[PDB]
């Protein structure tokens, strides 16, 4: 009854924003960024190589003090590394071998993991008994998880492949709010530096801003073709970058709802698996399927380096808070700390 | 460095324990299940004995451990968790050969699974769990395959016989089976082999076909590591 009538009006509404977006579009940063000295070739080599994993690596997360990090794999083991002396602080055995995400609490007392079992688990690192044990169980998602992120020490944000993202309360264990409005599987998520807003990347060629307290989809951005694999906040709080299966990265802005740059090359055809900035919004490290990472340039859209020390597909990469090191996981079952 | 020398000692006690876990984990072999609602995946395992979609059944034959990764409740899209299963030794696929209407979409699943970018090394073990229904359906003659499949005007039995029974039933069995095999023999390059089989709901010796075909899957890769092929 109302399906046909409402569809016609919906299409007109989209065109009004599209015309407004086109009208509001003034210029492009490609021409403006022509009066800046190029960064030049950037070369880094491994300083450490973390051995001990016996399966493909899915995700990793750095620490607050830029010395400790955690990683997960198909081995079903969660490992905390000392990136300085290559020592192993802890080795946490997971409950389900199929996991896709990791997190490290800002205070440093907790970690998190989740995956195909539709649960994000919480572990207490600093206990009196001298062992690491699970403290909170978080269930209530009908699809596999893709990203868990702590807010301060007691609120975690989760995005799964069931079209919805939810905000939790660790102490009580119930969803305080629920965020919905997507269409397909959600793959990536990133919290703002001020921990007030966050974005989400779905398998819909669409990404949406959010408000944590209320639960209202503030904005919606489209433009990609295939699914969206990775998302991350620019270290200012006004932008974010999305990595899709089109072998293309592109930069969004929160005051324009339009793309600014697109990082692509004819030779590059393989898809993108991870994206993260580094401490200045000047280097954009992307991890592709063609057996190596890639160091982009978020202002000039040109290549500046390759992390070609890996012999398999790179699935994760992160950068320290201090901006010192850059780890990188892949399917070699090896973790390499570059600099 | 007195405290630092003791920290580096537990890191090597952890390494000793992690390597032990890798020795006990490579003893087993990994398997999948794909099929339809009425295909009969569950009944195959039973004869050989919340939202947790992974059933994860286990069975034993000939002193070799097997783990079968029955994943269910996978929403609507499948192409996002297959890439997590690209390390198994074989994929088990079940087809309803009885329901003629639900056969063109049985080939649809096979064609796309046979051509995954993440499943370009794993060889499929094709199954056909419905065999007794075909014999009873052709004898009763409720419907004719010609309307669904108008290819009997150019097909005949190519000098094959299986026990004896009605040759009318056997020629019907072969047309469906060679329909699936003809899809397979278009992209494999020695790294893919289908192993089609005919099974019923009473058949119990299913586990040998998984076991015997797992020798060839591993034998054919020992001939490749040695540069013999």
């Amino acid at each position: 009854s109302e399906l046909d009538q409402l569809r016609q009006e919906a299409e007109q509404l989209k065109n009004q924003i599209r015309d407004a977006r086109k009208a509001c579009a003034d210029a492009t940063l490609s021409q403006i960024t022509n009066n800046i000295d190029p960064v030049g070739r950037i070369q880094m080599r491994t300083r450490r190589t973390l051995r001990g994993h016996l399966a493909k690596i899915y995700a990793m997360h750095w620490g607050t003090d830029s010395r400790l990090l955690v990683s997960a794999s198909q081995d079903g083991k969660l490992i905390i590394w000392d990136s300085y002396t290559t020592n192993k602080v802890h080795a946490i055995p997971l409950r389900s071998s199929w996991v896709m995400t990791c997190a490290y609490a800002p205070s440093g007392n907790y970690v998190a993991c989740g995956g195909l079992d539709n649960i994000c688990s919480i572990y207490n690192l600093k206990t009196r008994e001298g062992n690491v044990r699970v403290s909170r169980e978080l269930a209530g998602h009908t699809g596999y998880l893709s990203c868990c992120r702590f807010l301060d020490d007691n609120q975690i944000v989760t995005s799964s492949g069931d079209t919805t993202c939810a905000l939790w309360d660790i102490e009580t264990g119930q969803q305080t709010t629920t965020f919905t409005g997507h269409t397909g599987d959600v793959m990536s998520l990133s919290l703002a530096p001020d921990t007030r807003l966050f974005v989400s990347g779905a398998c819909d060629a669409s990404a949406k801003l959010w408000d944590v307290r209320e639960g209202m989809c503030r904005q919606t951005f489209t433009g990609h073709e295939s699914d969206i694999n990775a998302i991350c906040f620019f270290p200012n709080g006004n932008a974010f970058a999305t990595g899709s299966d089109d072998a293309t990265c592109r930069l969004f802005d929160l005051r324009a709802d339009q793309e600014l740059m697109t990082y692509s090359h004819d030779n590059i055809i393989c898809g993108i698996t991870s994206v993260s900035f580094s401490k200045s919004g000047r280097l954009l490290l992307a991890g592709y399927d063609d057996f190596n990472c890639n160091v982009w340039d978020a202002l000039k859209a040109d290549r500046a380096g390759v992390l070609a020390g890996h012999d398999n597909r790179v699935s994760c990469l992160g950068v320290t808070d201090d901006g010192m090191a850059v780890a990188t996981g892949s399917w070699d079952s090896f973790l390499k700390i570059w600099n | 460095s007195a405290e630092d020398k003791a920290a580096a000692e537990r890191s090597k006690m952890i390494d000793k324990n992690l390597r032990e876990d890798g020795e006990k984990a490579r003893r087993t072999l990994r398997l999948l299940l794909l099929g339809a609602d009425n295909s009969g995946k569950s009944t195959i395992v039973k004869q050989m004995r919340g939202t947790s979609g992974i059933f994860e059944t286990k069975f034993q034959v000939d002193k070799v451990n097997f783990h079968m990764f029955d994943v269910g409740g996978q929403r609507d899209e499948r192409r996002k968790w297959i890439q997590c299963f690209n390390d198994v030794t074989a994929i088990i696929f079940v087809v309803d050969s009885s329901d003629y209407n639900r056969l063109q979409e049985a080939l649809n699943d096979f064609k796309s699974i046979w051509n995954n970018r993440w499943l370009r090394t794993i060889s499929v073990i094709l199954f056909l769990n419905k065999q007794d229904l075909l014999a009873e359906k052709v004898l009763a003659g409720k419907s004719k395959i010609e309307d669904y499949f108008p290819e009997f005007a150019r097909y005949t039995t190519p000098e094959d016989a299986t026990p004896g029974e009605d040759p009318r039933v056997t020629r019907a069995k072969y047309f469906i089976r060679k329909e699936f095999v003809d899809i397979s023999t278009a992209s494999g390059d020695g790294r893919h082999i289908c192993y089609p089989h005919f099974t019923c709901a009473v058949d119990t010796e299913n586990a040998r076909r998984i076991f015997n075909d797992c020798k060839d899957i591993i034998l054919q890769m020992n001939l490749r590591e040695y540069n013999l092929v």
Partner: single-chain antibody
Framework: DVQLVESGGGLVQPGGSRKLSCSAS????????MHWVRQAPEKGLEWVAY????????YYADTVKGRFTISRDDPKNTLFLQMTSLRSEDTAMYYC??????????????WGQGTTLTVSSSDIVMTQATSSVPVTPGESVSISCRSS???????????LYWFLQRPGQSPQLLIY???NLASGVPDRFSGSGSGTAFTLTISRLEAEDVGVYYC?????????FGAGTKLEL
């Protein structure tokens, strides 16, 4: 809860033998190192031995090298010390201590109740210059130790520890790397120093602060305590 209970004391002739034992409970007694510490009657504290997790590396005090033996039984959850040919200087009170060594851990957390043994009739030296101090509640008191060598390492740590031996009690951690404060004590306590000279700092004193202050180094395994510093109202 965590509790170390130990026994095995008594009277020993000058030349006999004796064996002590701890009883670890309430914690994973498979990832912690272990120690022993003496206390001569109305004197300080001194080491007896050491053993790590997995019984890998052992160290001994030079005073009793080749005469004492320390053994471990992980499934039994019990530590052992065997003494041979006891002398007349071995009359003291023995303590059981746990220690875990990884990045950020606090060694020497828990101390045992203690047993008394009686017998019938190149190193970093630290001296506590001050012996006794009369204190009043509500004031600030600074307590210092002196070091023979600088404890600062190339890492950046400074292996200095502090302990509280209240009357009829056992020592407990306050500060374990001259800066960091162990969990379970009020924030009024503090510690500071640089290389050679060290000092404590207490803001507001209460009634239950009377005892003896001890200081530690953790650089060279022949580890040595300090003298006594008594605080009295």
């Amino acid at each position: 809860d965590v509790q170390l209970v130990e026994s095995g004391g008594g009277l020993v002739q000058p030349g006999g033998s004796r064996k002590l034992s701890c009883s670890a409970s309430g914690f994973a007694f498979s990832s912690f190192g272990m120690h022993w510490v003496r206390q001569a009657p109305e004197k300080g504290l001194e080491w007896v031995a050491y053993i790590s997790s997995g019984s890998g590396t052992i160290y001994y005090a030079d005073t009793v090298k080749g005469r004492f033996t320390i053994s471990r039984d992980d499934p039994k959850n019990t530590l052992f010390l065997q003494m041979t040919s006891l002398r007349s200087e071995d009359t003291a009170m023995y303590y059981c201590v746990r220690s875990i060594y990884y990045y950020g851990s606090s060694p020497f957390d828990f101390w045992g109740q203690g047993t008394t043994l009686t017998v019938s009739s190149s190193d970093i030296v630290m001296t506590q210059a001050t012996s006794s101090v009369p204190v009043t509640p509500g004031e600030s008191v600074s307590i210092s130790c002196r070091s023979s060598k600088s404890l600062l390492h190339s890492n950046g740590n400074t292996y200095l520890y502090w302990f509280l031996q209240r009357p009829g009690q056992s020592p407990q951690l306050l500060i374990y790397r001259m800066s960091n404060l162990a969990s379970g004590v009020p924030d009024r306590f503090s510690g500071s120093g640089s290389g050679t000279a060290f000092t404590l700092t207490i803001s507001r004193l209460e009634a239950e602060d009377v005892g003896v202050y001890y200081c530690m180094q953790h650089l060279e395994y022949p580890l040595t305590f300090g003298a006594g510093t008594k605080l009295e109202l």
